[PDB]
Symmetry: D2
Subunit: 292 residues, 4 copies
C-alpha cells in the first residue's frame, strides 16, 4: 500500500541552547532532507533521542513534522517502547496528529520472549488503522525478532515493513523469501545498504543520509543499473562515513556532522555528551574527505 522509497531517514531531534526542541531548526532539517534524497522520515526514534524525550515532546514533534512535511513524503513516528500499553497510547496520539505510519522497536531492557513480542506488536497494530513498521535491533534490545515471529506478524494487514538492524543479510534473505512480496524488508545498517539490496531489501533506514543522501541515492541507482564499479566506489564512501558517525554514541556524531556543514541542530541530552576535541578533529577529517 504505502511506499517509504529507498532511503528513510532516522531523523535527529534538534535542540536549542537550553535543550528544548528547536522547531525552526526542525523545519530547516526536514526541508534539507527532502531536497537531498530522503524518501520517508522517521520522527523521534533512537536517532531522535527518544529515550530523553517526553510523551508531550514526542507528540509536539510528530505534529510539527507532519505539518512541515505536507504529504511530500511519508512520516513515520517511533511510537514503540518496552511497555505495550504505553505504546498503544502514544501510537493513538501520533495517529491523531496525522502521521502516516508507526515504527515499533523490539522491546529493550525487559527481554521478552518471541510469543511475548508477537502479542506486543499484534496489540499495538490492532490499536490503529495505520501501517506498522517493525524494528529489530539486537545491538540495543538484545533480543532478536526471529524470522518466524516476523513472518507471523507480516500476516497482519497493517504490518507492512521491517527495519532490520540485525547486521545479518542471511536473516534478511530468509525474511524476504518467507514473506509476501508486499512485505518490505529494509536494512537498518547504513554500510549494509548495498549487499542488502543485492539480496532483495527495498532500501535503507539511514543515519548517514543526513550528510550523504545524494551519494546514497546515486549508489543505489548505479547498482540497479548494473554499474558495479560505480556503486562500489560510493559504497566505500558510505562505509567510511558511517563508521565516523558511530565512534561515539549516536546521534552526537551526526548532530555534530550536520553542524560542520552549516546546519546546527544543537547538542544532546544526558546520558549523551558532546564530542571531545579529539573526536571533533577526527570526524572533521572524514567530513572533509567527502568529495565535492
Amino acid at each position: 500500500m504505502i511506499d517509504f522509497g529507498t532511503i528513510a531517514t532516522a531523523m535527529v531531534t534538534p535542540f536549542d541552547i537550553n535543550g528544548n526542541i528547536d522547531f525552526a531548526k526542525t523545519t530547516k532539517l526536514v526541508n534539507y532532507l527532502i531536497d537531498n534524497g530522503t524518501t520517508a522520515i522517521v520522527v523521534g526514534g533512537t536517532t531522535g533521542e527518544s529515550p530523553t524525550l517526553t510523551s508531550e515532546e514526542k507528540v509536539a514533534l510528530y505534529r510539527h513534522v507532519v505539518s512541515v512535511v505536507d504529504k511530500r513524503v511519508p512520516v513515520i513516528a517511533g511510537t514503540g517502547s518496552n511497555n505495550t500499553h504505553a505504546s498503544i497510547d502514544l501510537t493513538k496520539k501520533a495517529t491523531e496528529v496525522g502521521v502516516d505510519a508507526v515504527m515499533l522497536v523490539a522491546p529493550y531492557y525487559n527481554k521478552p520472549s518471541q510469543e511475548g513480542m508477537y502479542q506486543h506488536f499484534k496489540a499495538i497494530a490492532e490499536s490503529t488503522p495505520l501501517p506498522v513498521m517493525l524494528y529489530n535491533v539486537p545491538g540495543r534490545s538484545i533480543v532478536q525478532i526471529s524470522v518466524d515471529t516476523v513472518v507471523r506478524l507480516s500476516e497482519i494487514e497493517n504490518i507492512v515493513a521491517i527495519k532490520d538492524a540485525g547486521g545479518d543479510v542471511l536473516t534478511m534473505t530468509e525474511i524476504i523469501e518467507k514473506t509476501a512480496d508486499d512485505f518490505a524488508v529494509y536494512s537498518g545498517d547504513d554500510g549494509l545498504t548495498l549487499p542488502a539490496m543485492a539480496v532483495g531489501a527495498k532500501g535503507i533506514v539511514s543515519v548517514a543520509s543526513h550528510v550523504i543522501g545524494n551519494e546514497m541515492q546515486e549508489m543505489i541507482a548505479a547498482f540497479q543499473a548494473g554499474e558495479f564499479k560505480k556503486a562500489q566506489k560510493l559504497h566505500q564512501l558510505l562505509v567510511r562515513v558511517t563508521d565516523s558517525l558511530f565512534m561515539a554514541p549516536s546521534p552526537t556524531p551526526v548532530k555534530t556532522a550536520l553542524q560542520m556543514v552549516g546546519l546546527d541542530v544543537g547538542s544532546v541530552r544526558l546520558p549523551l555528551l558532546p564530542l571531545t576535541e579529539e573526536e571533533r578533529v577526527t570526524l572533521q577529517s572524514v567530513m572533509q574527505s567527502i568529495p565535492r
Copy 2:
C-alpha cells in the same frame, strides 16, 4: 554508614486480575520476605516490572512499602532509567516518600559511554542526600560500567555500593580491591552468591530469595563458619532453583512460584506473559524438589 545486609531482595510488584497494583498483597509479601531472610528490599526494579509502571504508580508503591516496612529493613527504590533528568525527578519523589536509598541502573537502549555513564550517575547522586547503589547489568543494558568508572564513582560520598549482575567474579574482585573498605559490592546473580562472597562480596541482590531465602541465609552462615560441605549442598540447590526461575522472562517464573507456595501475587504486564501449562509443569517439579 548504611547496611543492606547479606540478602537484598529484588521484590516483584503484585498485580490483580486487571493488572493493577495490589497493595494488600504487597503488604502480605513484604512481611513474608522479612520473616524469610530478606535483609533489604528493592522496590520497583526490573523484577518489580519497572518498565510497565507509570511514574505515579512507582511513587505510590515506594510509599506503601516504606510504610509497611516501618524501618525493619532498608528500602531501595529503583529510580534510575536510561534518561538522566527523569532519573533525577523520580529520585526526588522517592526521597520524599521516605525511602532509605536508590538503585541506579546502567542506561539501557541508548548505549552511553563510560564518561557519559560517569556524568549520568554523578548527576543523580549530586541531586539527592540519599545513599546510592549502582547496578551493572550488561545482560539487559549491553554496556558494562567499567571497573575504573565504578572506582571513580565510589569516591562520591553517597555512592556506597554496587549490584554486579555482570556474571564475573574476577571483575567484582577488582572492584573490591580498588575501592575503599566502605564501598560494598553485591552479586546480582543468585547462582554466584557463594563464589562471590568467597572473593569478598558483601552478599546478593536476589530473586531466588522470594522462595528459598531461609536456605540462602543458612548457606551463607555455613560458609562463614567453614562448614564447606553444608554450604556446597545448599549452593547446589540455589543454582537449581535459580535456573528454574529464568527459563522464561523474569519476573514471571517467580510470580508463579509464589502462587505455588500460597502467596498469589498475580501475573505480569505486556510485553510479558503468563507461563504456559508446559512451563508451569516444569517449574512445579523443581519447587517440589526443595526439601521440607
Copy 3:
C-alpha cells in the same frame, strides 16, 4: 599472478571402507567438479579433513589430484597448520609435487598475535615460489586476521588472495579498499557469495559447489550481468542448501549429499561421525528440493 575463478571448491577427501584414501573415487570427484562449475580446487583443507590426514597422506593426495587435474584448473594445497616450521616443510613437499598455490589458515588453538601471524605467514611465503592464499576463519581458529595485518601481507609479492570466512562483508570491503587491485578477496561462506561479490569480492571458496555448482555458476553469471531477479532466486536456493550442509559438523553432510545424488565418497574419520539416520532423512529432503 594466477586466476582461481569465481568458484574454488574446498574438496572433500574420499575415504574407502577402512578409512583410507580412495584414489579412484578422488579421480571421479575431481572430474565431476570441473564439469560442474568449479574453477579451482582446494586439496586437503578443512573440508578434506586435514586434521586426520597424516602428512604422508596429504602429500600422496596433493600428487594424485595434480596428476588428474592435468592443469585444467588451479590446484591449491592446504599446507598451513598452527606450526610454522611444519607448514614450511609441507609447503615444500607440496611444491615439489607440483600444485599451483598454497592455502594458509590462521593458526588454530595456540591463539597467536597479529604480529605473530604476520611473521608466521611471511616466513611460509618466503619459503616458496608459489602464490599464497590466506584463510581467515575466526569460527574455527578464534583469532581474526585483522584488516591491517592482511594489508601488510598483501604487500608481499606471492601473497595474492584471501579466503575470508569471517562472515562480515564490511571487513571484506575494507580489505578490498586498502589493498591493491591485484589482491583477490574471496568469500569463504557460501551464503555470502552474492552480497560479497556485490561489494567487490572476486568469488567463493565453496562447499555447496559439491552438489549445486552449476546453479551457483548461473547465479553469478546472472548477477554479473545485472539480472537481479534470477540472481536473488538462485541466492535463496544457495542459502537453503548451504544451511542443510552445516547442521552436523562438516564435512559429514556434504559427503552424505554426494552419495545421495550418486557419488559415494565414503564416510569420515574420528572425531567425526556419520549422520544419524534421522539427520540423513532431514538432509535427503533438502536434496530432493533442488529443481532437476
Copy 4:
C-alpha cells in the same frame, strides 16, 4: 585411586638458543616446581607448546620428565589432539615411557559434536590402562564439553578428572553434583581458583604456579582453614599476577617471568614471539609488586 593434589602445574617446555628442548633447564624447572608447591606435572600441553612439538620431541620430553620426577609427583602427559587415531598412538607411547596419566583436550579446529567427542574420548580411554583427565577449553577449541557429556565420560572407569577452563563455576558446580565423589573437578583458570574451590573443585591446573605457587598453596590452606580475609589478599595477588601472564599469547609471558626470577627457560617457537620491550617493562613491574 590417583591423586594429583591442589596445584597441577601446566609446565612450559624450556628451549635453548636454537629452539631445541633444553634438558638441563627442564631438570632445573621440574625440581623448582616440586619445591614450590606443584603437586603434579602436566607435560607437553598447551602451555608446553605442544602444537610446535614433533611427536618424537613430545615423547622425549615425557621420558626426561618422568625420570627427573622419579615418582615424587604424578606426571600427566598431554597426548590428546583433534585426531582420535593420532591421540591413541601418542597415548600408547606415553604409557610405555611410564607417565602416570594423560590429559585429553576437546578437539580444536574441526568443531566436533557432543557425541563425536564422546566417542573420541571413549576410544582413547579404552586404549590405555592409565588414568585420564578431560580438558574443556572453549576459549581455544570453541566447542564445549557439555555437562551431560562429561557425566557419561565419568562413568568410564579410567576417566577420573577434568580441567575445566570454561570460565564458569556454575557449569563446574553442576558437573560436581552430577558426577560421583571420585570424579575430580579442577579449575583450568587461575583467577578462579578460590571461588571454584568454594563450590567444591579439587583445585587448580595452573600457569601462575610457575612464579607464585607458594602463595597459591598459602591461599588454598587459608581458605580451607576459614581464614577468609587472608585467602582474599592472596587471591587478589593471584588474579593480578595471572592477568599480566595472559596479556600476550601464553606461554611467552610466563617464560619471560621465569627468567626475571632467575630461571631462564629460553623463548618460544613460531607462530609465537618474544615479548616486546614494552611488554617486558609492563610485566616486570607486576613481578616487582609481589611481596618478597
